[PDB]
Design a protein around this nucleic acid. Structure first.
Ligand code: MG
Ligand code: MG
Ligand code: MG
Ligand code: MG
Ligand code: MG
Ligand code: MG
Ligand code: MG
Ligand code: MG
Ligand code: MG
Ligand code: MG
Ligand code: MG
Ligand code: MG
Ligand code: MG
Ligand code: MG
Ligand code: MG
Ligand code: ZN
Lengths: 200, 104, 52, 50, 82, 118, 121
RNA sequence: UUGACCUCAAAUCAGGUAGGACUACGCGCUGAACUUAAGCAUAUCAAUAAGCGCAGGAAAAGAAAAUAACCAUGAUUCCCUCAGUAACGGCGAGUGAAGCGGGAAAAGCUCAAAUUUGAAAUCUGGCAACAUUUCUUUUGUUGUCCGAGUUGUAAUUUCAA
RNA sequence: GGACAUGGGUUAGUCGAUCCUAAGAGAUAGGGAAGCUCCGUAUGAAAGUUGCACGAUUUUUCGUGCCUCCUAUCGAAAGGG
RNA sequence: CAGAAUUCCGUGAAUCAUCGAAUCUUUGAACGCACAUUGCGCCUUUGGGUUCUACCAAAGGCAUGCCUGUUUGAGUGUCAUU
């Protein structure tokens, strides 16, 4: 159907069609609020594959996030420590800008659950994302076995605990030798806990 | 639950035999057990493991056949036996699978 | 108000900003007369309503 | 100061009330050690500090 | 001049009674309680101050509703008449 | 669509009033502070007695939240007398005292005896 | 001491009248207490106070039951009449909501349910 | 002129919902220095203290874009072992995992990508009736109408197919 | 005895506070910030209490109307009143 | 210390136990706006005092963000019919 065509065309971000549409939409986005409601997904095919459905209780929000690194917020570049910690400028936040987009939209919609998010645009100053949210109080959500899980209280603010797709990526959650540091603190605890058995 | 017998990897342990996770799809096929039915009667299914040799296949197919021959399936509706069930369920008791099908 | 300004300057920006052909082929629509004939045929084959 | 808020005045009333001797029958109870108290505040000695 | 005589001019309060926690710690000009952080919608607390936390945490007060919850759980939150 | 001002203002829209599907509170509360809460007790100190027999005024301990309006109604409803003026003070113990002067057609001494604190 | 089972048999208006009598009486006992009184009247203050409470409880019990009656079989009920469990329990998925299954899942349970079986040695 | 659609508002609109607290344990962010190196800057202390966000009865993880190099294994977690080892390190002081093997426990699955197209088969809300209850406090069923939805709600499928 | 014990004692339309604004404080719009929060005070906001009787019997403030550069609040027991 | 013997072969003592119905002041996330003020308002209904507009009293209400839905709208955003 149309979804395959939208998926393939979305891969062509340098084509004349997508370059033009990106320019006009980025201009339009910069004219409205940093966080604003989207009436519909700008990328319906991308939204579906990330869990979105066109039913009551699913909500799309758009947000722009400042690009670039994290300047150390210390008074006059003064760090009061050893030279290894004197850096102020070329530093980087450990969470993705997409994660920040989810965090801020989740605070903005504190009655909703953040499901997922996707990139839509960027200029030199901002990256634009659309965040998919679900109303756990809506009956259409609570009676739906495919999205029911998110009502349970263990899924409260899953974006704040790195439990969305981008949150687990930023946490380095993965299988095998490349992710041995694993959940870091839990792995660290296992290796730094002295185990003293009853030798009898 | 009954488990397959598999050879451990690496040259340090490939001379041994141990319990594996579950029976392969080919092993269940050759023993006449549908994969959807296998779980309902305590036969684990491992979709990941495969049979690279006839020896692994035959060894585990024999384990399933011995399990099925010792298995008493109760009818879904009590007192109305059906196909694949048993009509002498009176002498049913909790027994160890390792007592019947040990890893040799 | 900002929303009115936005939807008006959006039409302007589409007028400048030379449009790629795959987008420019839209805004070339059926004329009024052919459009009426098309809708006359379409209005004959309407889907059945919930009452029907 | 005699210019005082209602909230301040309420606190002064309470402070004056807690600044009283305990009736003796309270200390005469079986199993009570309320015989003497270290909560006897006096205006010149220990200040309320609002 | 810095000692005894200068103590004679101390007659202006920098702190008054906090409406939230009742301590004489409400800084008048900052309109902020130095103890509990009122009027911020969060109670001021620091992990370097475990003793301060102990002075004010749950159980140092009446626990009126929490005791009712505890009794109700004991019987499974039942309602109606016996 | 003629705009003679260079200022767009929000148009006026309907703004319905609340029509709840359920009352949030099942039972309305009875009047708090009606008349048995407003008047706590007569005050019968020596100074209050002088007020009774010299200025035709009664002295009452009243609720902290009573005012001169509600004290007047309470005295009329409880003791069927008509105060002409009411003065109020909050005592250093934190309780409220009311000086209730009666009209020249009523005798405060008789009212005091009828209440029974004499 | 008024008997509460006798109180429930009376109309709300009569109860309201009885309550006013008790409050008037309690005011008299307090006036007499100020101007000297024996120990019987002092014990009568406490008894009269508990009688006022008994009457208030009956009046409120009657009013609340009437409200429950008015809201029987209504979708939306006054808040004080709803459950008073915990906030989390009120927000939890209902057993009905939890037991909802897709058609695919319903078919799977119908055709491949876990059997009862035994191994004979 | 009206109406449709789109986008955007307002209302003490009908019904909901979030915040604060508890932090032993849990998931993240941010982030020292004392200290050790017989000085000291890399290093170490430490991916620690302090600071900030967010949960539950556990959390997180989880049905391989995993191991291996075998006669192969087979989601995750935890224990013993691997192992103070491979490796990192002013190769200084110091630091330091993983696969196999044994054991505890075991459980497996859901979507998006498909034309239902001889029939949106889907869902919410209002109203009414009928049931139901840890419960007049709970939880549904049917009918009807209105909304949602074709810029796609259901149904068969999820690669093991 | 300003100590100790038992009691008593402070009455307002006109005196203050309350109202106003001052230096300043500070929500909101909006933008920063991982965040605690920071900046901001008609500000890049659809930020409206007020001015008209057109309906309305009939001797009067509820309905649309077309309207117009309005405004959070806190902040003085010696300023204003 | 009493008091209560209008009770003690009893729906009845007890600061008894237990607990499924209620009450639950001013506050506090704290919610009309404030608050070093028991300071200053608004709405609905019902009563009081001559008062459909002032005043007094009582009951019930009035915070913010967001979601589904409702209503009333806005746009030289896009259209059909006159
Ligand atoms: Mg998970
Ligand atoms: Mg000095
Ligand atoms: Mg000075
Ligand atoms: Mg006065
Ligand atoms: Mg050193
Ligand atoms: Mg040294
Ligand atoms: Mg040194
Ligand atoms: Mg810490
Ligand atoms: Mg909990
Ligand atoms: Mg979990
Ligand atoms: Mg898979
Ligand atoms: Mg290290
Ligand atoms: Mg003295
Ligand atoms: Mg004056
Ligand atoms: Mg002021
Ligand atoms: Zn405080």
């Amino acid at each position: 159907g149309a979804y395959k065509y939208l998926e393939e065309l979305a891969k062509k971000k340098q084509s004349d069609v997508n370059l033009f549409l990106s320019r006009v939409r980025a201009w339009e986005y910069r004219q409205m609020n940093v966080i604003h409601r989207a009436s519909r997904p700008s990328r319906p095919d991308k939204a579906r594959r990330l869990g979105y459905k066109a039913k009551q209780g699913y909500v799309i929000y758009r947000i722009r996030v400042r690009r670039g690194g994290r300047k150390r917020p210390v008074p006059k570049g003064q760090t009061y420590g050893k030279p290894v910690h004197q850096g102020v400028n070329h530093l980087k936040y450990q969470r993705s800008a997409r994660c920040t987009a989810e965090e801020r939209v989740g605070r903005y919609c504190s009655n909703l659950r953040v499901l997922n998010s996707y990139w839509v645009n960027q200029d030199a100053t901002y990256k634009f994302f659309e965040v998919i949210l679900v109303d756990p109080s809506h009956k259409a959500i609570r009676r739906d076995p495919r999205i029911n899980w998110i009502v349970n209280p263990v899924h409260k603010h899953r974006e704040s605990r790195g439990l969305t797709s981008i949150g687990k990526k930023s946490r380095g959650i993965g299988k095998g030798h490349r992710y041995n540091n694993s959940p870091q603190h839990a792995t660290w605890l296992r290796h730094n806990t002295l185990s003293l058995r009853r030798y009898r | 639950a009954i488990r397959p017998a598999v050879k451990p990897p690496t040259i340090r342990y490939n001379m041994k035999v141990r319990a594996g996770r579950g029976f392969t799809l080919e092993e269940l096929k050759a023993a006449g057990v549908s994969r959807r039915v296998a779980s309902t009667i305590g036969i684990p299914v491992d979709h990941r493991r495969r049979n690279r040799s006839e020896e692994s296949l035959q060894r585990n197919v024999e384990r399933i056949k011995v399990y099925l021959a010792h298995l008493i399936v109760f009818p879904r509706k009590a007192g109305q036996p059906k196909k694949g069930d048993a009509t002498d369920v009176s002498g049913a008791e909790q027994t160890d699978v390792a007592a019947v099908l040990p890893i040799t | 108000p900002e929303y009115i300004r936005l939807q008006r300057r959006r039409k302007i920006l589409n007028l400048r900003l030379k449009v790629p052909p795959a987008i420019a082929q839209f805004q070339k629509t059926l004329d009024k007369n052919t459009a009426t004939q098309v809708f006359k045929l379409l209005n004959k084959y309407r889907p059945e309503t919930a009452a029907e | 100061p005699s210019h005082k808020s209602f909230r301040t005045k309420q606190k002064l009333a309470k402070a004056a009330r807690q600044n009283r001797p305990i009736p003796q029958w309270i200390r005469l109870r079986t199993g009570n050690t309320v015989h003497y108290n270290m909560k006897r505040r006096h205006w010149r000695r220990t200040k309320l500090n609002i | 001049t810095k000692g005894t005589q200068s103590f004679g001019m101390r007659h202006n309060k920098s702190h008054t009674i906090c409406r939230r926690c009742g301590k004489r710690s409400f800084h008048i000009q900052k309109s902020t309680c130095a103890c509990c952080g009122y009027p911020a919608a969060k109670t001021r607390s620091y992990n370097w101050g475990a003793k301060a936390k102990r002075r004010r945490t749950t159980g140092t007060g009446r626990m009126s509703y929490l005791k009712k919850v505890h009794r109700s759980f004991k019987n499974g939150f039942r309602s109606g008449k016996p | 669509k003629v705009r003679t001002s260079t200022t767009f203002r929000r148009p006026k829209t309907l703004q319905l009033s609340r029509k709840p599907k359920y009352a949030r509170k099942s039972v309305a509360h009875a009047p708090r502070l009606d008349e048995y809460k407003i008047i706590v007790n007569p005050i019968n100190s020596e100074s209050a007695m002088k007020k009774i027999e010299d200025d035709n005024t009664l002295v009452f301990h009243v609720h902290l939240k009573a005012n001169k309006f509600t004290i007047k109604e309470a005295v009329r409803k409880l003791y069927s007398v008509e105060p002409v003026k009411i003065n109020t003070l909050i005592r250093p113990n934190g309780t409220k005292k009311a000086f209730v002067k009666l009209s020249a057609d009523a005798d405060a001494l008789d009212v005091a005896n009828r209440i029974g604190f004499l | 001491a008024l008997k509460t089972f006798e109180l429930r048999k009376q109309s709300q208006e009569n109860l309201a009248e009885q309550l006013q009598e008790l409050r008037q009486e309690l005011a008299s006992l307090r006036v007499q207490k100020i101007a000297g009184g024996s120990g019987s009247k002092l014990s009568k203050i406490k008894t009269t106070r508990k009688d006022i409470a008994r009457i208030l409880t009956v009046i409120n019990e009657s009013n609340r039951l009437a409200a429950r009656e008015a809201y029987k079989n209504k979708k939306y009920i006054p808040l004080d009449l709803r459950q008073k469990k915990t906030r989390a329990i009120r927000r939890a998925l209902t057993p009905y909501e939890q037991s909802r299954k897709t058609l695919k899942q319903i078919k799977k349970e119908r055709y491949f349910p876990l059997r009862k079986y035994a191994l004979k040695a």
